[PDB]
Each structure stands twice: as C-alpha cells, then as structure tokens.
Amino acid sequence: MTFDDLTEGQKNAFNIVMKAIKEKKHHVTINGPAGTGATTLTKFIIEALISTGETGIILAAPTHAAKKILSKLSGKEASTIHSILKINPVTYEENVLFEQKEVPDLAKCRVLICDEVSMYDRKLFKILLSTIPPWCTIIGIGDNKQIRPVDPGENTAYISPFFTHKDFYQCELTEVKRSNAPIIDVATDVRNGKWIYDKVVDGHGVRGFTGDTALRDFMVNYFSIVKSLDDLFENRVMAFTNKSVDKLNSIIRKKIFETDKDFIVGEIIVMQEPLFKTYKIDGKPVSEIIFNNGQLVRIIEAEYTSTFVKARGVPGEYLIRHWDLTVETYGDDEYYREKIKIISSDEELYKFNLFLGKTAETYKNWNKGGKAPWSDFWDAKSQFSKVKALPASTFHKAQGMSVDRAFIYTPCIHYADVELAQQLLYVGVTRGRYDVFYV
DNA sequence: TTTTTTTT
C-alpha cells in the first residue's frame, strides 16, 4: 500500500523475505497472529514482488475456499498446492487415497507463496519439501495459534511444519496500532492462555452467558438478534463437535422458518464435499467441478423421494429414501443449476452403507469372470452428496470466514485437549468483526 | 471422545 511504511514486524518480515529469495537455499514462514495485520503484509509481498519484475510467482492455498479468497486478495490467480504438487486421488478397491502422481516441472516458479500454512499436515508437507527445487524459495504465511492440522492417524502435539522444520526461518509479526479492539484483545489473551471472557466497549464486544439459565438466555438473545432473518450470512454460531452443531441448526431452523422439514425452498446450505458432474465419452469418463467444497447454494426444487440403487454383481435392489434437491450456485462464483441426491435418515443412511459394503465385499473378491465392475460402486455411491444448514458450523470449518457477529458454544469443547481447545476459542473469537457471544 | 483437506 504505502510500499514500505508498515509495522516494525511487517517492515522486518519483508526485508527478511526478499533476502531469502535473493539468496539461494533458505525459506520463510511469517507468523501473523490476529490483529497483527498479516493479510495487508501478504498483499504487499505480492504487489512489490511483481514490480521488481519477478515472473516466477505462484500462489498456493491449502483449500479451495482458501484459494478463492487468496486469489481475491492479491488479484492474481491462485490454485491449491494439491493442484501444483499434482496430488491426485488414486482409487483402490473400496478406498481412495491422494498421492503425488508425478513431480511437476516448476522451472517457471522461483517464488512459491503459501497461505493458511497452519493447516499443513506432515504427509502433505513432506511431498512439498521433496518437490520444490533449489531455485525456488517457499514463503509460507499463517498463524501458529490457529487450529492445528487434523491428522487422526498420528498422536502428537503436531503444529504445521512451517513453524518447526529447520529449513524455514520464521519471523513473528509485531502488534499493530492500538485502537478500540474489544474482540482483538480477548483473542490475544486466548492466544496467551486465558479462557474467553467479557470485554465490552461502546456497547459492542465479547459477552457471555452464565448461571442457572445459560443456554435459554444465550438462545433467547440469538433469536432476538437473528429473529426470522433468513439472512444469517453475518451471524455464525460455532461449536467444536458436529453432534452439537447438528443439534443447533435443528433448533435454529425450526424457529426461523416455522416447519418441521429437513430442507426448505429458498434456504441456503453449504456443500461439505465437491459436487462432480461426469460425462462418459468413448467410454472413458471426464468430470468438471460444479461446486467446490464449501460452496453455499440455494434450494429451488426440494422434494423427498426414494431410489432403487443397485450394482451389477449384487443380488436385487435396495430402497434408499433420500431428498431430490435442485440447487443453484449462491455467490460470486460460476453459476450452475443442478440437482443432488441427499440422504437424511439415520435409518436410511444405514440401509445404504449396508449396500455400499456388500458390493464392496463382492468386488474385493470377485470371480464371476472378468475383474470387477467397480464402475457401479462409485457411480452408485456418488449418486448422493453431503450438506449442512447455514446457521451453524464447526470451529474447524469456520476458519477464515469472517462474520459480523459470532455466536460461540463452549459445552462440547472439552472433548479437545487444552492446546487445541485454546486454538478453537482463538479461531472462534476472531470470527466476529462487531460482536462475539459465548455460552 | 473429538476435529477433516485434496484432481485434470
């Protein structure tokens, strides 16, 4: 923006950066915490880097929604590191895994910028390190105090290697201009180990609910602020577990739209996984991305019907009652109108997984002659998608999403060990621009 | 007990 006029932390981070690029082998990760103004720095690292005449820049982001908002902030285009490292899903019998098909050329990139580096697990990181050549220098940026990478397969503290591995020289971003920042304060105390508390200035700030009536108060304060508003777009209620998140959208939806219904026309919902459209040509399929994971979409035609799923190589048909839901892109992204099959019954889903495992068993060992008709496995499985209602999300899924008012639900947070639960509250708190509430 | 990403 000012070119160089910035915080000492920024001014320095920049100077370190350029010399890591200007000399050979070395790397960098900047730790912006919240309030330290990490984004504007990142913006400046880019604009400046292009005007020095550097051709070799690429912007890599850990996720799709992350890549969207990265590409939007710089104005230059950016893809996922998976796209770059060329990490391609490879199908095995009943499973799927993401491994690196082949190492990309990467002679046209002398500077590799990563965003949200606090999401990198090790399996991904190693591929990364083994890929980038010496003529390239990785500059990561993220928050060591954000929610640590999810790696259920391995037990250990385990923050992203950007903040550990020897090859990276990491500098910290210094605190910014002191203004009235009730939320930034609390969040900076949470980063430092205090639990959430109340600080209110001017009438806006972090406010909790305690005593015998806690949830009733907290909820009655929600439905007053949200009311029948079908715009929750700026009000996000968060929780650790999905069990709680699910309980919430239930209660919340039932009051705002007065119904008992799983889906309602004109409601906005969020894709939990990508939606793929696949055409077969000359027998060999191709697929385009209709909806990225995290895309919000609007319900237009919503009807509850059944389906008879089958698989060649399995006896009979099975009746799976699901929703036929036609849905369009809601947002600043590409507009598609489509229809997905979506199962809500725990009763019905179970019935399906039953089938899903039977055909698996029979293809896993098949001598009928031939090899195995796996095409009828996934074609049949991909028939159904995953979604969640807009109002509430898990702390994990809310990273990077900034809303006017954030509503935080503590009770299930204790299922997380201290280190993480602090990362959760940190993430949770920093989501609200204006107000933050917690029970 | 609990959280979850990713491709032409």
Swiss-Prot record:
The species this protein was found in: Enterobacteria phage T4 (Bacteriophage T4)
Phylogenetic lineage: Viruses, Duplodnaviria, Heunggongvirae, Uroviricota, Caudoviricetes
EC class of the enzyme, as a word: isomerase
SUPFAM superfamilies: P-loop containing nucleoside triphosphate hydrolases
Positions with a binding annotation for ATP: G32, P33, A34, G35, T36, G37, A38, T39
Described function: DNA helicase that stimulates viral DNA replication and recombination. Plays a role in T4 DNA replication initiation by selecting and activating DNA origins. Acts by dissociating and reassociating with the DNA molecule being unwound. Unwinds DNA as a monomer in a 5'-3' direction at a rate of 250 bp/s and can efficiently displace proteins from the DNA.
GO biological process: DNA replication
Pfam families named in the record: AAA_30, SH3_14
Enzyme Commission numbers on file: 5.6.2.3
InterPro entries in the cross-refs: AAA+_ATPase (IPR003593), P-loop_NTPase (IPR027417), PIF1_helicase (IPR051055), SH3_14 (IPR041214)
Catalytic activity: Couples ATP hydrolysis with the unwinding of duplex DNA at the replication fork by translocating in the 5'-3' direction. This creates two antiparallel DNA single strands (ssDNA). The leading ssDNA polymer is the template for DNA polymerase III holoenzyme which synthesizes a continuous strand; ATP + H2O = ADP + phosphate + H(+)
UniProt GO molecular function: ATP binding; ATP hydrolysis activity; helicase activity
Keyword terms of this UniProt record: ATP-binding, DNA replication, Helicase, Hydrolase, Isomerase, Nucleotide-binding
Lineage: superkingdom: Viruses
Name of the protein: ATP-dependent DNA helicase dda
Subunit structure comment from the entry: Monomer. Interacts with UvsX and gene 32 protein.
